[PDB]
Write a protein that binds this ligand. Sequence first.
Ligand code: AG7
Ligand code: AG7
Lengths: 164, 164
Amino acid sequence: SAPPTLWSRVTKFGSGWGFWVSPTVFITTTHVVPTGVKEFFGEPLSSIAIHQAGEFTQFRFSKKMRPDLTGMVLEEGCPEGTVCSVLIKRDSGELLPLAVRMGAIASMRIQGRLVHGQSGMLLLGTIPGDCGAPYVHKRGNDWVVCGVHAAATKSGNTVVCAVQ
Amino acid sequence: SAPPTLWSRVTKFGSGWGFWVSPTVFITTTHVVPTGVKEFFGEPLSSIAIHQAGEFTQFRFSKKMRPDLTGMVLEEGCPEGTVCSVLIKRDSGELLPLAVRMGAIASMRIQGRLVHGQSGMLLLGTIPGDCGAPYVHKRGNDWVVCGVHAAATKSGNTVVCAVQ
Ligand SMILES: CCOC(=O)CC[C@H](C[C@@H]1CCNC1=O)NC(=O)[C@@H](CC(=O)[C@@H](NC(=O)c1cc(C)on1)C(C)C)Cc1ccc(F)cc1
Ligand SMILES: CCOC(=O)CC[C@H](C[C@@H]1CCNC1=O)NC(=O)[C@@H](CC(=O)[C@@H](NC(=O)c1cc(C)on1)C(C)C)Cc1ccc(F)cc1
C-alpha cells in the first residue's frame, strides 16, 4: 500500500490531476493542462520551466511549492510485467489504487496524436476525470513514479500512461 | 501511522474539516459549519439529519456519500494517557499528523460556552483552519476516532477535541 505522503502528492489540476515529484517538479498529462490561463498554482507561466511532449507535461517551478516533500525518482516507464498502482483520487475523496500489470513501452497513435506511453492490463476502471493520476511501484525500499494516466480503451480493460 | 483510507475520510468543509465515519455519517465541530448555504456536498440541508450537541456536529445523509468506506468505531473520547494522532491536512496538500497525549474528558467553558471535550498536551501548533480534524488511535488492529479538533489555548500547548 502506498504511504499517505505519496497520495498527498496527487493534486487536482485542470480537468484532472497531477503529481508532485519534488517540491518544485509537477507532472501531468497534456490533455488535462488548463489553457487560456496566465498562472499555474498562482505562479506566472513565464517563471515555470516546461517540458511537454508525447502527452507528458512536466513543470519545474522557480520556488518551492511543496517543501514538505522529498524529491523522488521519476523513471521512463517500468519493466514489462511490473504491477503498478495507479493512484486515483475521485472527487468524493475516495482513494482508488488500481493495480495494473504493465506491458510494452511504445509510441502509439491515440485519437490522431502521438503518445509516448506504456500500456497495461487492469487487474472497476478509469474515467475521464482520472487523467494525470500517477503510476507508481515500489522497488526495494523506495517508491518510483513511472507515468501519468492518459487513456483507456472503450472496454476499459487496458490503460495507457504517458511516460517521459 | 494512519493508512491512506483513514486520511481519505478527512474532508475540507466550511472553514476547516470534517470526517466520514461511514458512507452516510460525517462529523465536524459546530464552529466550522457554514451558515447561509443551501446544500452540503450537493445535498439540500432538508435531506440531511443534522445533530448538534455543544461543539460536536454530526450529519447523517440520506444517500451513500462515501460507499467505498467501512463504518468505523466512533468513541466518546479515549483513555487518559492515550497518544492520539490529529489528522491535520494543510492547504498545500501537506499531511501534518500531530501527536497529542490525551488527558481528561470534561465539561469546560471555552469562550463562554460549556463544551464536552477531552483536553490533551501537544508533543508546529494547531491553527484555526485545523478545526474538525479527527483525533484517532489504533487499538489492536482497528483504528478508532474519538473526537474532532475544537480549540487550543493561547500558548498552544493544550488542545481540546469535541467528543460525542
Ligand atoms: C481532455 C480530454 O481527455 C480526457 O478526458 C483525459 C481523460 C481520459 C481518460 C480515459 C477516458 C475514459 N477512461 C479513461 O481512462 N483520456 C482520454 O479520454 C484520452 C482518449 C481515450 O482514452 C480513448 N482511448 C483510446 O483512444 C485508446 C486507445 C488505446 C490503446 O487506449 N485507449 C477513449 C476512451 C476516449 C484522451 C487522449 C487523446 C489523445 C491522446 F494522444 C491522449 C489522450
Ligand atoms: C470561529 C472560530 O472557529 C475556529 O477557528 C475553529 C478553529 C479554532 C482552532 C484553534 C484556533 C487557534 N488554534 C486552534 O487550534 N478553534 C477556536 O478558535 C475555538 C476557540 C479557541 O480555540 C480559543 N481557546 C480557548 O478559549 C481555550 C480554552 C481551553 C481549555 O482551550 N482553549 C482560542 C485559541 C481562540 C472556538 C470555540 C469557541 C467556543 C467553543 F465552545 C468551542 C470552540
